[PDB]
Amino acid sequence: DIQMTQSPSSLSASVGDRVTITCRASQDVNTAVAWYQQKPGKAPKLLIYSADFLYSGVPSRFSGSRSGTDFTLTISSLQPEDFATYYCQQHYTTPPTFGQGTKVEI
């Protein structure tokens, strides 16, 4: 069962800051990493699928990227609404495993 390790667990930042979140897989997932945003009160929303593809409708300040092992989500200029928790997930093999989550407080 694939372990998704997120880093960091939490962070603070101001409107307009770039912030990077990093996800690591215990085993190969050949590019199948997704990223979700869940705002307080709301259901998760898909932002990025297969590491770096942006889901239609999602603002281009969100960016996903790969380097193996590892996986990276960057919000390049933080908006007020982007306060939320962000979760990576591998969708390579069943079961789909989630990262611990990173609470972005803004």
Binding site: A43, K45, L46, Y49, Y87, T94, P95, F98
Partner: protein, 118 residues
């Protein structure tokens, strides 16, 4: 394209509850439906999935042997039967679609329904 859930409430432990997940805008025959749970302090946790065409299922170890999934393709709806409920099952429960057979991960999610084990 929408997923809408019902059925969450205060449940006595050892009790049972049936969450449902109704779909609009696509046919659940075309896809897997997943259930995913958010327990406080435990992030997001995959719970189960169903392939409605043949009703094949997979369950997470935390719920295997207690929960089952079912589906009615005519009403375009999937059901999470929750038996033998516990304290640890207290969570917001979501259903989601496995978009493009998993190529798009969980591209559609329902609003969530809170299950409280009182």
């Amino acid at each position: 394209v929408q997923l809408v859930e019902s059925g969450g409430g205060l449940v006595q432990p050892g009790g049972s509850l049936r969450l449902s997940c109704a779909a609009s805008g696509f046919n659940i025959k075309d896809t897997y439906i997943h259930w995913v749970r958010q327990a406080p302090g435990k992030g997001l946790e995959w719970v189960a999935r169903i392939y409605p065409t043949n009703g094949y299922t997979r369950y997470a170890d935390s719920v295997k042997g207690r929960f089952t999934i079912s589906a009615d393709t005519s009403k375009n709806t999937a059901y999470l039967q929750m038996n033998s409920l516990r304290a640890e099952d207290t969570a917001v429960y979501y259903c989601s679609r496995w978009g493009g057979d998993g190529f798009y991960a969980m591209d559609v999610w329902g609003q969530g329904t809170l299950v409280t084990v009182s």
